[PDB]
Amino acid sequence: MKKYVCTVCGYEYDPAEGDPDNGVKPGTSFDDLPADWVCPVCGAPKSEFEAA
Ligand SMILES: [Fe+3]
């Protein structure tokens, strides 16, 4: 349930919440996001998130 933060915009990916409108149900770990997922607030890539 390790949260990750976007280092562009500060958005926090929270595995307990997922990202439904991008097809990520609640409970999905950050490491299991789809290869094409990007930060939903700013568009940044997953390579620019850090553990939070
Ligand atoms: Fe972002």
Swiss-Prot record:
InterPro entries on file: Rubredoxin (IPR024922), Rubredoxin-like_dom (IPR024934), Rubredoxin_dom (IPR024935), Rubredoxin_ET (IPR050526), Rubredoxin_Fe_BS (IPR018527)
Pfam families: Rubredoxin
GO MF annotations, alphabetized: electron transfer activity; iron ion binding
GO BP term, example: alkane catabolic process
Keyword Phosphoprotein in annotation: no
Localisation: Cytoplasm
Cystine pairings recorded for this chain: none
Rubredoxin-like domain ranges (all copies): 1-52
Cofactor: record remark: Binds 1 Fe(3+) ion per subunit.
Listed cofactors: Fe(3+)
Entry binding sites for Fe cation: 6, 9, 39, 42
GO cellular component: cytoplasm
Gene3D superfamilies, alphabetized: 2.20.28.10
Record keyword Transport present: yes
Lineage: superkingdom: Bacteria
Keywords, ordered alphabetically: Cytoplasm, Electron transport, Iron, Metal-binding, Transport
Family from the record: Belongs to the rubredoxin family.
Function (record text): Rubredoxin is a small nonheme, iron protein lacking acid-labile sulfide. Its single Fe, chelated to 4 Cys, functions as an electron acceptor and may also stabilize the conformation of the molecule. Electron acceptor for cytoplasmic lactate dehydrogenase.
UniProt name for this protein: Rubredoxin
Species: Nitratidesulfovibrio vulgaris (strain ATCC 29579 / DSM 644 / CCUG 34227 / NCIMB 8303 / VKM B-1760 / Hildenborough) (Desulfovibrio vulgaris)
Gene: rub
